């Protein structure tokens, strides 16, 4: 069941992906609204896949190791230059996260693009599944592919102050490494901004 | 059924899978309008109390169901038993606006007065949690501010509410027993 993703000019093809899972929508809501009065200009040089490291899922991380990433995180390329030199923007974020498992070491990772991350008291982690999520388990699929649309109190919002989405990754079953399974499996999630717009050009120094 | 599962696809099986049948469901009670229509007591403040949600106690019904969704939209019906004329202001009014009293008010009428104060916040839909200051919610998510010389109680009922983006709900803690075992109401003897 090869899935051949694509965004802009970078591709990603995983022969083990189990399936894309749209969260909260299949498409983004209208873009030209009372805010900005129509000065928004879809930018399309930012729709790209960019890697980002995550915690090295180890044999010993017990249930409930929430490694969050807040989005958009510090991008240094085109998206970074863009969020630097533009006042307002919006995106959907078709995240993708991988765990290369040897298929002999059992474990069940749970990735979930939770919106408006607040802290978990470790009772909330039992039912954290409400948010869009995919299970990563070396058993069957080393790859999870989530896409969520931009949802915030506003149409646009400065990414420096209110970062809505935060990819969280809980560990439901400790990596059991058997005789032949990998000792230490790292998780690299590729996050791609989608349907990005901009507005409020800011005078750069 | 044995569905692939790992994709976290929404799978629901019925008792039909073993010579059962599924009876009809009437879920007119677990509805989110009919469950948000009821009053819920917000803590009262004697001077210039500000009326807004996320101040209710977390474990009450409306409070919890509210924290159950990130983005809530709703108009309020408020019930206050104040002791002097009670004045309200919209969402962006300077705190000194409360003494003008030409803005909406209500004079002492015997018991508690019941108002309807619509949803005025400029944000497209409010939030029960805000990641990043712009933990305290920003100053803009209040509905109004109601100021009486002394406020005794405030009840608040959200009309035509609609929620979004569900969140955890956190049922009561249990300790080394089979079930919670709370004394349910029983007839006399």
């Amino acid at each position, epitope marked *: 069941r090869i899935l051949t993703t694509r965004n802009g000019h970078t591709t990603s093809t995983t022969q083990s992906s189990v399936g894309v899972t749209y969260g909260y929508s299949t498409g983004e809501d209208h873009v030209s609204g009372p805010n900005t009065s129509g000065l928004e200009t879809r930018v399309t040089q930012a729709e790209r896949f960019f890697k980002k490291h995550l*915690f*090295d899922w*180890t*044999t*010993d*991380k*017990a*249930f*409930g*190791h929430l*490694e969050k990433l807040e989005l958009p995180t510090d991008h240094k390329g085109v998206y970074g230059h863009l969020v630097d030199s533009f006042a307002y923007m919006r995106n959907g974020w078709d995240v993708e996260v991988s765990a290369v498992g040897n298929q002999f070491n059992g474990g069940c990772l749970l990735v979930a693009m939770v919106p408006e991350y607040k802290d978990f*008291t*470790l*009772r909330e982690k039992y039912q954290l599944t409400l948010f869009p999520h995919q299970f990563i388990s070396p058993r069957t699929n080393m790859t999870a592919h989530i896409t969520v649309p931009y949802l915030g109190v506003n149409r646009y919002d400065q990414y420096k102050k209110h970062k809505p989405w935060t990819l969280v990754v809980m560990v439901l079953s*400790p990596l059991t*490494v058997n005789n032949s399974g990998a*000792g*230490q499996i790292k998780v690299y999630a590729n996050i791609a901004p989608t349907y990005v717009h901009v507005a409020g050009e800011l005078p750069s120094k | 059924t044995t569905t692939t599962g790992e994709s976290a696809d929404p799978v629901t099986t019925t008792v039909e899978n073993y010579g059962g049948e599924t009876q009809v469901q009437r879920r007119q009670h677990t509805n989110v309008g009919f469950i948000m229509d009821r009053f819920v007591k917000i803590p009262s403040q004697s001077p210039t109390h500000v009326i807004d949600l996320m101040q209710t106690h977390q474990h009450g019904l409306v409070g919890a169901l509210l924290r159950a969704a990130t983005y809530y939209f709703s108009d309020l019906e408020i019930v206050v038993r104040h002791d002097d004329n009670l004045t309200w202001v919209p969402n962006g009014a300077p705190e000194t606006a409360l003494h003008n009293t030409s803005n909406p008010t209500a004079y002492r009428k015997g018991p508690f007065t019941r108002l309807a104060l619509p949803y005025t916040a400029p944000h497209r839909v409010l939030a029960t949690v805000y990641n990043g200051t712009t933990a305290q919610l920003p100053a803009s998510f209040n509905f109004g501010a109601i100021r009486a010389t002394v406020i005794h109680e405030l009840l608040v009922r959200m009309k035509r509410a609609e929620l979004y983006c569900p969140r955890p709900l956190l049922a009561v*803690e249990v*300790t*080394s027993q089979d079930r919670h075992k709370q004394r349910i109401i029983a007839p006399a003897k």
Partner: antibody
Amino acid sequence: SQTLSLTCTVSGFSLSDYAVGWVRQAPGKALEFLGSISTGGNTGYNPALKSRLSITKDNSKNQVSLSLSSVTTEDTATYYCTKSIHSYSVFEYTYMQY
Amino acid sequence: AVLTQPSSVSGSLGQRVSITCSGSSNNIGRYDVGWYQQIPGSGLRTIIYASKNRPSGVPDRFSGSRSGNTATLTISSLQAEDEADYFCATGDYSSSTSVFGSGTTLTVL
């Protein structure tokens, strides 16, 4: 022959939510893991110092107890309590890290 | 004392000073380490648990990197007060008891 037992009243961080474990700083900068007890009650001891201690937790009193076998010239140390995340420890030596 | 870590390392205000932890595929190769800070007149404090995580209240300076067979505690810019003894916490499959680093005791110079 001076069997000792010491407890530290947990302030917040409920034992079911977070499991505690003792650890002692041996004379000098040396450190040594004394045991851990998972939130449910199951414990994991230091196999070296094993059979010499007992770690019993009570959910009501909101405290935890450690009953060591006896004291010697090496047993004297600055003792400390820990609040690990990951309330159940997958491995006994694994907790030392969190 | 299974983990050998620099017995001492010297620092100055302004620059980035890191501290390796000398481990092996037994304990640091497949298991995550911890970094504790101990002042002369104070006990322990946890700086980096789970190796790459930072607990509540620690300044953004401290960064924990486990890349490679030797964990490194990387400080952005050493400060005159962050001068303290750092310890290594990790789990080794070979011995039930965990291994603890002897220390690194910083200086300001």
